[PDB]
Design a protein around this nucleic acid. Sequence first.
DNA 1: CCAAACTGTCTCAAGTTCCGGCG
DNA 2: CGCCGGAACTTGAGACAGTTTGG
Length: 248
Amino acid sequence: ENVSGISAYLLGLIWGDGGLYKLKYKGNRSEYRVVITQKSENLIKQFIAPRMQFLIDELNVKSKIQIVKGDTRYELRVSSKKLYYYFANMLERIRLFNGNRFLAYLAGIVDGDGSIIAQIKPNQSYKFKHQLSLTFQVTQKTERRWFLDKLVDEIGVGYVRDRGSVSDYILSEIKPLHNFLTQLQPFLNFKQKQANLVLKIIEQLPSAKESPDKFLEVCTWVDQIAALNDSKTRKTTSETVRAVLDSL
DNA sequence: CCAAACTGTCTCAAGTTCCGGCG
DNA sequence: CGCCGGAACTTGAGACAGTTTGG
Ligand SMILES: [Mg+2]
Ligand SMILES: [Mg+2]
Ligand SMILES: [Mg+2]
């Protein structure tokens, strides 16, 4: 990892779960912030802080990395006019990011506003009564739909769907999905495990369809992905599938 | 019977801005 | 004026479920 990749990734995370703020305070004071918010403090300390510290050192930025606790999430914050303008201008050079720098950038956007999903959908039309569904998605407020459109243009596959105030970029085609995640995975931090579990499920999907036991095993891996995600409204699990197969 | 698209929803985890203090 | 520490304040998310299409 170098500044080229670290900086691209961070910009992605900043855009996704943070922001760049130029503030004006009373008493003729001011502040410039580079921020990344995240519910988990450990995740920030283990993956983000080290990378930001590295970039800060290489850029000779003297400000300190602050980790502030908020009501609903933790916040990694660097109060630096220099770092602020560095990222704000890079914002305009994204369109020129080459292969690997673009992947680091994307990984940043994914660890922030992305979701790597595995689902078991009940459908009586399938032999084992369920469809094994895999999804890569990026959600963005509808005003930034142009961004999702750009993703379709850059990645090459997938599409965009609007659902009110927000929209999503979606990729579910197994082959392209496997290829895309094989490329993005090394750059991910927060969602690297779910990325690799999705890769494993795809590689075992055909075998999963040839036997009830192998199908349940693979459903086990989807349970694991859901556990790694902020799973709150999940209904069909591997055990639900087992009960159906047993009654058959 | 399956891959992939289409359509809808649940419950937050993000994002944004104001305050007093420092050098 | 710009660098700390905090936290109130206001949203964009994530992560599923359910249903239908077309080879
Ligand atoms: Mg976001
Ligand atoms: Mg986000
Ligand atoms: Mg996030």
